[model samples]
Target chain A: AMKRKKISVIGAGFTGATTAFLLAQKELGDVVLVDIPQLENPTKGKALDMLEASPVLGFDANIIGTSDYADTADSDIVVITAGIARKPGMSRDDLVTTNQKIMKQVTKEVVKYSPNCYIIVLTNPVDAMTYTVFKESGFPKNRVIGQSGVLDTARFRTFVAEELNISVKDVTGFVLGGHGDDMVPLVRYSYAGGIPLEKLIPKDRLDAIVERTRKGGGEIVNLLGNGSAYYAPAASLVEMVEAILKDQRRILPAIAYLEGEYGYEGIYLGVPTILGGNGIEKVIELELTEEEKAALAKSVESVKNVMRMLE
Target chain B: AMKRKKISVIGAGFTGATTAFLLAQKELGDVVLVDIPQLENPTKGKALDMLEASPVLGFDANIIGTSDYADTADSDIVVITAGILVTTNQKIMKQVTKEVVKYSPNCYIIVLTNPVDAMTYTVFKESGFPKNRVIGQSGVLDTARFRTFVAEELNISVKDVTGFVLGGHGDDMVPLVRYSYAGGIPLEKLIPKDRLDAIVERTRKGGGEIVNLLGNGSAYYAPAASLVEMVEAILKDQRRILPAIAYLEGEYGYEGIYLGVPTILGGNGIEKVIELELTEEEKAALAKSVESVKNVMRMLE
Candidate 1:
């Protein structure tokens, strides 16, 4: 007798499709997966494949695959993943140009369908794309957010756990700043269970792990020889979705528009933010070391460069 | 402060690996995946791959891959998925049951080996564990398929459908039509008898259909996920009612036999076996199902 929630995911590609699958499997809510008209069949096909497993999975949620925004009307939340992926040789500016246009159109459609909806941007150049959706939709800044650091932080934690031969659940912390290479991983806020990470891993080893995490997405891309990671990206995205759906009030890092937090303005960058039903409830400003502060500044500049290209 | 539990999964194949992954992802407990020494690398490899996702998925559970039962000592529950896929097998069950109980004598044992009814009976006899501590995973998988098909045919969300398949895990399984309800309404009133019968037949052949599709690989996600549901219910003491293969002593007039029946799973494992009022037709089908299970048991003997 519970009131079922509705979620709309734009783009039925790997990340979007997997997100819908996990959401359905968890019985988070009813889902609508939207892709371009040409990819409608694949969307519906994946939806059907997942639906066919429902009886065995024991979850009750309708999954609709469509190319129409009407199917996504009145959603509780809309996840924007409808953009072209980065190719092997594509420049960051080139990737941003293509995805920004897609995000603008998709954002307008999503707002038209679910105006009161909280938006989560999964499109790349995520910091800038999140800013675009925030400005274009005319929604309050709190309603729009981007997924970045959680995914980055996941890679950081994974390496630390593997190196220490311990459980990943025991490792806790956040990766800050941009989602890409120039991102800052603060060892200050990290720990293994309750023990600080620095107490466990040596400086040289920690540095190597940090470097590997910076290239985590590329490592997967190189391994696959084609597509970028979908598992971790989809998993990270769900953490935000679950926070919003359940009003968990979990503290994680995501891209949010800064009206002067972390010495940034009029742009979005990954920072520790509280995610709840309201979305991006608060941006946390942590005291950083001089080195940490300098690293974060560079990441901020990287994100700002992407925003400049959008102009 | 919470008491973190330990779950040991025997056999590092698809079902075992996926079960470990789901348990870890759900943060149910710490997991230990064990396989034969010869297959140690593959087992460790799968465990590592799943462990890498922990950070991204934001779950906190240690995953250990090994060929050592010492790593699994004192586990809260031991899931036995280590056996060849077939309709009848006893040697693997005998060996696994002996090893598992030696490691964690007090742990709840969930037998996922094929011919689960027979294997469950074997574990019960071989391990010398309490009847309640040793259960088999069959009814959950069978009922899952039943619920899935019922929901699909009615075009309703699978969550709204509540159905039970009793007896055994295969052709001899019985779907209780009268007890089956969709949104608490009897399924008979929702669908025609002919259509319902067709769906029931499909549910019985659910394993075969999946085997044909993948040609070689059997269904793991559903089976693995289904088994973990039982593990979670017990680990968290949820007191959720699920159907499972359990030793019945005079329940439903079946004594000294392990068969699929409605069970209440909790911290103590198979807490109760629920008996339902059966139609004369339902009764006959269940007897046949019991006979089929005994046939497998006799072959083992």
Candidate 2:
């Protein structure tokens, strides 16, 4: 008489395992964590550990780890964090050819099982990788999405809060177009406690913060000297998953398929959209200045360059 | 000016760091994570990592890491999860206790090191805090493991399974299966006696099971989760009915010891130690548990 949602995370790497844990921790639903063969035992151990911890957390969830798509059957949402990481001093574009093949192979199996499921991509060269998965899965545009702006803005929000010596909850940030160096940081739309950041933080400090946000992923990787970040990336994925399951209709920035939105057609780029039960329900088009518009065009050209190499 | 609770966690070990992260993620209040001198930089890095992830977590907290006890001044709650197991740790308890009491004499202290019953008593007598303010954390963790195993056996939700334990932390601990239940139905009524007994035995060795599985460390997530529940009950004054390690003057016919018992936790920490009528079998088991704690207490002196 009761219904529970079925969600799967493809990958058992740091971000993948951590996202599955947070999903179970929050009691979002039953989580299926998948990895390649031979790595399956460690994945299972991680899931079992979380279950043993379930009671103490005041939550009851079925967290399963496997290497088979059969276990991910009938899933409502499938998140892909399964791709090669972009190393320091290595541009995200270099990851395109390898990750594109991985995305297609993953989509092929994921779609064979759950025909109606939604997919969210986290592989680097994300704008192109998302488009690759979207095209391969043959799913509706709204159901196939990617993550970029949420993480980009989160780093921006964190830096601004530190700069202003204020709480992070009071800061909000906006980014458009693509990720990495080509990301368009919309300064006019960002705010700290309802006051524009321009009025609160010094001009030079704000510019430096924006630069740091653009290179956020690289900063953490360089500090670690080994792996990339997982905690924040995992958190951003859960935030979107919760929105869809709870049908909150929150206006979050996501990599959505555009057919003439912002004068860009036939590509998936980061834009503000309402994410609810239907997935990427609607994209909100914002008014932009000449400078902002020019920057976004450059971002689009970079994305198109990657798309050209996808064949 | 807005008011927020100030919480300090002593120890930057796995359990301690995890507890600090959980508290900050919940936006409970500004958190101060304290460790020894050599660990100060690592602790700060840990706290900084969490702050960088704060925006995605949708929480705003000033999570500071320091080696100075002065940073923990006037705290609302100070948790002690420092040190290892047993007597060498007895000294660890005294030193950390005096620092905490010196900085925030009025604060409530919850002790979570191994030999929890004895360690909590060490903090109590050393700090001279009122009995209610100094509490141990074994019972909450013990019962959670108990509830988890029972839920697994019955194939029911862990939320509906209520389990009880008394006396001490590990092997010396006593489980009252007669009092445990699922959806208000006693275990004896729903499950066979052999199955129930196996569940009880499994619950007793929960820590060892996790340790063996990992081949290294103990269970940090569960311990941290257990402590967070206690912190929330006190911070919000919820007055939840939980099993806690509390000091007893004459309860259960025991004196001058901190043991696991049913407790009502609230703003004053262990507000009341609930006394349950015990059968002959249960009473003798508790007496044996009491003697073990007494032996550990002897080691303290």
Candidate 3:
């Protein structure tokens, strides 16, 4: 029998359920979705609905929804999306601290079970929760990462591409530093169809675009009035997964840990990473301008401040 | 934007490479394979290759391979495996019957420009081949429909299922009818399960299993030995595209198209379609023993 690939998604909330749907449609593997034991019927009806489509969809993959830690055993990849959404009048700092406590429990179980699996953290206050998982799991630096930069970069590129009337594939941008609020936009690495984005979009417009990206997740949250965006985020994860599975060797910006690599130590932040079969195959370095680097450092300080609060 | 899901497999050689590979990958576009132009390459290489990988292969799709003919147009599902494979040493009856004469030249053109926006058919017997031939045929009547049955029977799981049965040309077996064969012989369907709950379904074994096994590695030589059994069960359809092994017609008393030959149902449970048209001597021997044996064996003697 050929070895089957498996993906375990934690949370089973809107984000994880949406991500699981995308993954199942891809037929990437047997999907194991887990949620908190305390939450009754974690995925509720979504898990069964996905399973019911098997006969019609015509692919054989077992999708199991559970709260059991053992069910997630031997998962090739584990996506940690268990966290609270920012409520009305809640500060970004408040959301980070709130989600951090959940990550402490979830990350502990994930690492305790599927330790070797590639970890993709998608919690709110993403930068802070990503740091939380890194410390909680005690997994290798490269193995543990977050889902901020890709999702952020996707939003940035999507807006620019839509405005330029160009294919999204032609647009590439890097949103680094933090996931939100104090996130730093790397203008130098951004390009549209090989043309520098600065040359295309006016500086004022580009600044607006940058600011929109920083609040991209929040904008979606406001629209839903409760939930955040998962369509693009899941799409972003699929892109990364395909890149790894097919060894496409596509260079994209991602949220990876920086151990003095980007002149930052003891922190997980957004940066460019060469994604491929061996997860986080290599951390790409960019020549950041003095001002750009300083801004990123400040964002990092903000995240470090949140981390201190969590502790 | 709607997600792109169009898949095309160029040529249906023995390997079935592009066809099975694309589908198995779950790229989920309707699959289209092209084969024609008197086939620059051999068909046996590509077609069989994909057939072998049928189990545990392909995304959702209606997979089709053709030799042109306008029926293949607008094929969100179009596979142009329109080539000709002719081997030597076969009898004149087999050699003189050319697939090219029957299939091309309009059919040949259909495969050339495929994944066309509109579906159309190119009738070879008509005027001349036109660009964008009309779509002639539709889609889903193959293994997908067949496996739906096997899935119902085995009661295991479809995701872990694989098997195929392929043999002869279009259904033509006089000898097969005599033996009561169903144009299928030595069909093997493997289910990766410990046991079956109900009586197993036999009808679901042919198409996928034969095609899949042919694609994986090299074609098995036992296939021919198995062919001898299925040949006994042929009908006017020239021979259903399936698997078989049996004694040739007339001389063996079972005269007509190939019949589904029964074999020792050992590790692999093989069935034989007992041909109806046996000689008087063979018929007498089959009848007298039945009534007396039933009478004596009723008590498990």
Candidate 4:
């Protein structure tokens, strides 16, 4: 029998809890869910409830919910989702400062416990927070990444599948750049059953879907009247976790600190990369059209500004 | 690229929707979720919502929620979960079995109806389907509970624990502890007899435990997951050796009846029933389980 891997998810909020649920559901590994002291009770409560379900669900993974990092020691992978939510009128700077401090504090504790672990950052302003984790943990660039394009690409694929009235399994989409309004959904790379998306959906409609993909997070926030999307985000994160733990070598888009890749310097941007046991094993550089390149450069500028704010 | 399998799930309630959701999540196949007309709209809405989640979850299976049996024609496998809760009505089981076989006679039939052994027997008799094509989902869920309790007690990964439950799906279940092991280590060597006894008792009453907790709904998450395992095993032709309620003829000394036992599941459904050397105690318990199933069949008649 293969030795089960251990994964620690920081923050017991929606995304973290959901991710923990799926990790166990897939029988991926033993999971440790950590949160601040205030949230520890609920975290423990959730873990207990899920544990009660194990006998029924038939998954043998142990899910531990705690406020102490001691329970998370020697984890193979650590996912950081510990950051403040974006309020209605919160400024980018306010979001950046608050989350940056949280990321730095979280990084210190995470690295202290699991020194050789791969870190996945899902905090907002993902590119910047991922960069903070990368620098604070002093881990190799491959060991640190941010989740953006996967979610964006998911949203892009969802709209494309809905429009085409085809199975989402047959749809393929790729989103690049940062994880915000300026992020680029490379429609050229999007397809349905290997058929180019443009051949099926008109440019105007595709453009509309692209715009919706840009605001997919906000759409869900508006629907809930509070909170951001968690289901898809958690699912996307699980895919990456699975790829790493299972050594699937899956190609995914994530926010990785780029050093001259995509003509950027020391900034985290969402780009396609090969993910496996060693984290971002290789950054895949796709040949982008000039228009796509321009869009990516703009997205890079947005992330660099956030990086400057952290400084 | 491999051709995706088509799975038609009868009923659109909690168990069915959750099963469809998981089927898509695992990318197991294209799912057709069929429910009654009165519940069709909600079914479609649920299917659409799950479909919308596909891009986010990275699964490509098409989920069609409908009331039309025509949509389910030529399905690769049909999962019947439409029977009333906790009791399998003869009329309902007969009707469902006939309609399912009518729609996809060649497809494998997995009966998730309560009183699974009896309902599986009903489907086989009514549809005139071969024994190998008809199976019931009882042992997988039962074995899951058994394995879980063992793993929880041993503080080991569930994946490392392997155990089998025979007889029935309820309190009368016979767990063959002698064959149960953790990474090939017998349960006796790992834990004391007393502790293992408690775990077996707990496993037998596993379904009721979840029922007591919820107060209303029977367990669906685990049940759906268990059903999906059987579906995947058949669709992928994984040839996994799992304990399921299979129609046995002279196997384990059972003349003709659907009973939960360790069976090989592959493309042809229940490919083989593995006969193990049961202790005298295990054999006695098995006889009682068979008797209980026979009693249920008599009551139905």
Candidate 5:
């Protein structure tokens, strides 16, 4: 009935470029890979390499690499991966504050070019940075999200799905609260089709997966010698994009703004929600124990602390 | 590196939803669409749809949909449209030509699965016929390719590349090719980037513009239609799949296998291609073309 959607990725670094390449071969839509003037070659190279695959891959999805904001005009979704990576000595809190400043500038440019675009924060300390973008860009909470829980939960699910030799599509789980070690993986709500995951994998094995899930980002970063996991993260975003484009109404865990929906308000937290053409449509709340709530509150405090560092 | 290629179309319906959809989607594991029943639906709806979106279209490629035995399996490219369309007044040659006797026992099936799968050819060909079975698959070639193309061409962050297709039991189309064409050419081609530099660049404009105009992912408008175009060209044996028309080679073309060279199509006419050296103008035109093909071959990394 309606047309396909347009999406723009800011910052053509590993995260952005990989995301761009995966999108192209998948037949998404015209994608604009935008970054600052400083990093044009790798960006352009990435775009060209992807463009070449059109014929072999058998679909003509267009992809462009540019350093200009004007080229991003009318993008429906803008992914911000434009800032620098965290240095060896920088604290996660420090990374969040620095990225927030850079993101503020980048978001201004993106909002200026794509006035109606949805924003997804992929920078570190995602919860805090997403909150900052909410205040800075002034879009609705639904239109602004982060890629933490979805990617994190995907890792958690992958471990279980791999062990059980089941379709990854059948294993469903969600990671809520923070996007870090303190993040909460909602194991109770998780299931393998109709059966709960708890019934599938033992508690000890599940606990190990939880630890691995928490360390997923660091593991990949260490393996790569620098960058974090782009293939899975990019793929996680692709899943979201597919759900939205097709109006599939698939439920996925995502980082979104909270208005006390998860017993936590005014902060952007990861939670289970429905993703469709309109972006994060509905937030499904789950009851948690006081301990879980306390951990989440602490996570929220961590995000607030990062925001405080910025001002 | 050799081209890992094969394409098959199941039916010869208007959309050749079988062969045509596969070719357009470039669902590359050797596309095959088979047809053992009757012309389930008119193939015209699918053909014209692929035509109108001419200027900015798909990756340049090839496809075929028919009931010819010479055109079936072990075929690097197979499209099954081997059924019937029992029209009363149609010529005798046409009837005996594409009957159910053509497709049988050992045929591998893409499984359009209409009415029922185990039933024999009772719809249009005749009453008494034996049933058959082979393979049943979801065919990721079409949708996977369709969504992938739109995502790349439009330069949209395709993390959300999604797809859908519809048409006749055979050549049906999803009615949205406009969402995917670029500068008037359907972008289905397997040539490498070394061959596509200039062409890919010139055509890149329309893809981005379509997205900027609608401000979302891509519009399925043209892509939906292109699926049908591939259907018609194959079923009708137009054989002519290109941008502007060119001279026809005495029978099919130079070197045969239906390259994207220009052609002329008609009934007595299948596809006629002309054999000639690349003209100075055409040679220059193909500089990017050569580059695209060569580069795509370099992806061992």
Candidate 6:
């Protein structure tokens, strides 16, 4: 009998923990929850909690936790959620440099263990941080992926569904450019069951939904008063991972290394890509209006600055 | 299309919250997660968290949390996971039953607070509902876990494995390995007798196996999921053949006792209790387990 696939989830915090359990709940594969030494106890404790949950949840995969990357050895995929948010008094560059170094360090360990594993980054400044792993791991650009666009589109789809009182699954959304302020929701391509969102929502309401998606993380942080939104982030990550693991060849928006696909070279940015057995198989480029082209230009500049911080 | 069903979960503890989330996740119904005043806001907070998760998990079932029983009024089913003791959970079931009966008097009630047999009997007597309408949970998880381990030992698919358990939960349970099969072949033929017994022993200690590992709390996810399976079976009229804790009346030569028995659960609760012919040894073991249940009933007395 064929054994189950193994997925390594580095970092046992909320996003990582939620991602780990969701992956196992779907019976995607066995999960190794990798964290740091300081959290050795919590890491294993959380795994045990989910392990006990497996039987009733009716999944057979084992959920193991460790700080040792060697435990991640031979994993089919390695997910990086092992970085920090911007703390009080930290400049944007400070956040960039800190996570950039952590990404490099974690990538080295991942390369040492699962050299051929597809790497997916969910850390902040994900576009640049993804490049950090791409460079540090020395893996093919297609093999090292990042996650931001999927979550951006999820939040946008969520808001649009609420705006029209339509089924969220029936709603379609597209986001271009980078995450945060540079996010551009291609309203013409978005629809509620096939009618363009631009026609259904007033231009101003559509703008707010677009801009609200731009700062979606902040809204969750404010509402929760503790952590930013994780369930959606974790679920989005699961979808991308499932695509690669199952060889679904799914067409979705994900962050991939760009060698001029969106006319941006030597950087990682959000675009519509097909994820399958080969990780990122294709980056779909659409004809963009000068408006979206200008936003991409800004996104290009913003990501370039973060990449320079990698120095 | 008929209206969506409503399931009211009375208790916002770990098991209660998990069951509520899954009920919504399965689109079982609009869930009412009712708790006490002390945890009302937290209950709402968790339900809110799951509701947010719904958009991501791609389910649209409505879920609410409150201390007010009125929120649970008109529910189609009410599941109790409020307490974990014989007398204590019985006391809770009595209180919960009256309100459930007062509002959704036509509802089905399922109990999982520990000492479930007696606790369910309390709800049965308190609500004056039909015996089938009031049931307890035990062997679905028992046999399910048994199937899990059996498949592990055989490297076979769980869907291809079938197993059954009799009597009560935990140590006092009686397992019939002879009746269990892998791909319709008897397990005893494929597995060594000693190994089969070991798996049975593990099945008996399944919950404790988890508790000792955690050292703080007992298993809730599986228990919660098992409860959800029962709720799904009843709501959809699945007519699933599984083991459930049901009231008895000399069906297995025992009367006035709630014990684990093979049952058909559908829209009307335990629609039929399936009586099996037992070997003398199996009968002896079942009698022993029944005495244990009766001893616990003495705790309620």
Candidate lDDT (C-alpha), each: 0.85, 0.86, 0.54, 0.85, 0.56, 0.86
lDDT of 2 by residue, B135-192 (tens): 8888778788888888888899998998888877667888888888999998889889
A1-311 per-residue lDDT for model 2 (tens digits): 02256789999999999999999887667899998898999989988888789878866568988999999988989999999866557654566878999999999989998888889898888889999999999998989999999999989999998888899988999999666788999888999888998988889999999999988998998899888989999999998987777565779999999999999999998999999779888988989899988998999999999998786
What does candidate 6's lDDT look like per residue over B155-191, in tens digits? 9889889888887677888888888999889999999
Compute DockQ for each candidate against the true complex.
Answer: 0.02, 0.02, 0.03, 0.03, 0.03, 0.02
**The 10-residue segment with the lowest total lDDT in model 1 chain B:** B83-92
lDDT (Cα, tens digit) per residue for candidate 3, span A1-311 = 12346788888877788778777776666788788777637564678888888768854556778899788888878888888866569876677777888988888888788877778877866777878888888877767777777788888988998878999888988777755667778777789988989889998989888988988888997798756788888787777765554444567776787777877877777787887556687888878899887888788888788777675
Interface RMSD of 5: 16.4
lDDT per residue (tens digit) for residues B96-173 in model 1: 778888888788899888888888898899989888899899878878888899888889998789878787766878
lDDT string, candidate 5, A246-284, tens digits: 454567877788897866787777787888657788998
Writing each residue's lDDT as its tens digit, candidate 4 over B178-233 gives: 88899999898998989999888888788899989999978888889999999877
Docking class of 2: incorrect
lDDT of 5 by residue, B1-301 (tens): 0122344554444435534654555423323344443532333344334433332453333344343444444433222232322222122223332432254322222222221111112222231221111111111224444545556656655445443222111122121232233444443343245533333332334345465887765434453344334333332333333221121124222211111233333212223443335446444544443343233223211
Residue A127's lDDT in candidate 4: 87
Where is the poorest 10-residue window by lDDT in model 3 chain A?
A: A241-250
Model 6 stretches astray by more than 4 angstroms: B1-301
In terms of TM-score, how similar is model 3 to the real structure? 0.57
Q: After superposition, which runs of candidate 4 have C-alpha atoms over 4 Å from their true positions?
A: B1-301
Q: Candidate 2, which segments miss by more than 4 Å at Cα?
A: A86-94, B1-301
Best by TM-score: 3
Candidate 4, position A255, lDDT: 87
Name the better of 2 and 3 by lDDT.
2
Candidate 4 lDDT for residue A117: 90
Interface RMSD of each: 10.8, 15.0, 16.6, 10.7, 16.4, 16.0
